[PDB]
Design a protein around this nucleic acid. Structure first.
Ligand SMILES: [Mg+2]
Ligand SMILES: [Mg+2]
Ligand SMILES: [Mg+2]
Ligand SMILES: [Mg+2]
Ligand SMILES: [Mg+2]
Ligand SMILES: [Mg+2]
Ligand SMILES: [Mg+2]
Ligand SMILES: [Mg+2]
Ligand SMILES: [Mg+2]
Ligand SMILES: [Mg+2]
Ligand SMILES: [Mg+2]
Ligand SMILES: [Mg+2]
Ligand SMILES: [Mg+2]
Length: 92
RNA sequence: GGAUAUGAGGAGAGAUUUCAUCCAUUGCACUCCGGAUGAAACACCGAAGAAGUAAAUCUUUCAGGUAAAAAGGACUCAUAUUGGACGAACCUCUGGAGAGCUUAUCUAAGAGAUAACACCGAAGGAGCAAAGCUAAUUUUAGCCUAAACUCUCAGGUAAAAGGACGGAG
């Protein structure tokens, strides 16, 4: 849990369409900064989880510190900093 | 060999894609990747029954099926029962699938012979399962072991021939 561009969100409802989930997240987080991508899947290992990459660390933090435990789909969002970006930012 | 019983062997082809609920999962990734049932969308198979035919495994795929398992399974063998040894071999007719009409050379070269790679499974051919019979304690060792399974020595991948199987006198 050490400041990063990408942040990790989990304990979110495990019955949503990967597309329609990607929707709601982009809709909620874009108001904090430039959302580069929302990585999500429905694989057993990566269920009920999501990532959101920002261009600047400062947008990742302001979203984190603010949107925490926010009631989203009858689940309190649990957000925290990632491990490593692995995109245009990391290795570039 | 038939017909029921039961034990045993028995192939093909989507571990597809959407979707409804149940069972698990708090999980830190940057190829898309958990089960259990159901209901649909094309794709595919030939081995319950079924329907065309004289009948059929040929042939249609309505029903049925599409990792292993599980169930299913034309056929195959073994005990038990019933009986026919005038649907039982033999002989004639004929329906009968699969997969290279690939290249080299012999003489003239799409044919055939021979080698080569690539296959197929239905003459023929080898190998087994339960049972069976021996035998040194659950262990068990052995030999005996059907088949369209298994394999592919011979055999076959355009026609002709062949052809397990089926029916017609
Ligand atoms: Mg059986
Ligand atoms: Mg745990
Ligand atoms: Mg058939
Ligand atoms: Mg018939
Ligand atoms: Mg059908
Ligand atoms: Mg039949
Ligand atoms: Mg065969
Ligand atoms: Mg033999
Ligand atoms: Mg035996
Ligand atoms: Mg041979
Ligand atoms: Mg021919
Ligand atoms: Mg003949
Ligand atoms: Mg044979």
């Amino acid at each position: 849990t050490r400041p990063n561009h990408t942040i990790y969100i989990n304990n979110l409802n495990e019955k949503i369409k990967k597309d329609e989930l990607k929707k709601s997240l982009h809709a909620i987080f874009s108001r904090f900064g430039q959302i580069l991508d929302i990585l999500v899947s429905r694989s057993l290992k990566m269920r009920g989880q999501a990532f959101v990459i920002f261009k600047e660390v400062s947008s990742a933090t302001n979203a984190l510190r603010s949107m925490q435990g926010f009631p989203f789909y009858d689940k309190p969002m649990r957000i925290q900093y990632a491990k490593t970006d692995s995109d245009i930012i990391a290795k570039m």
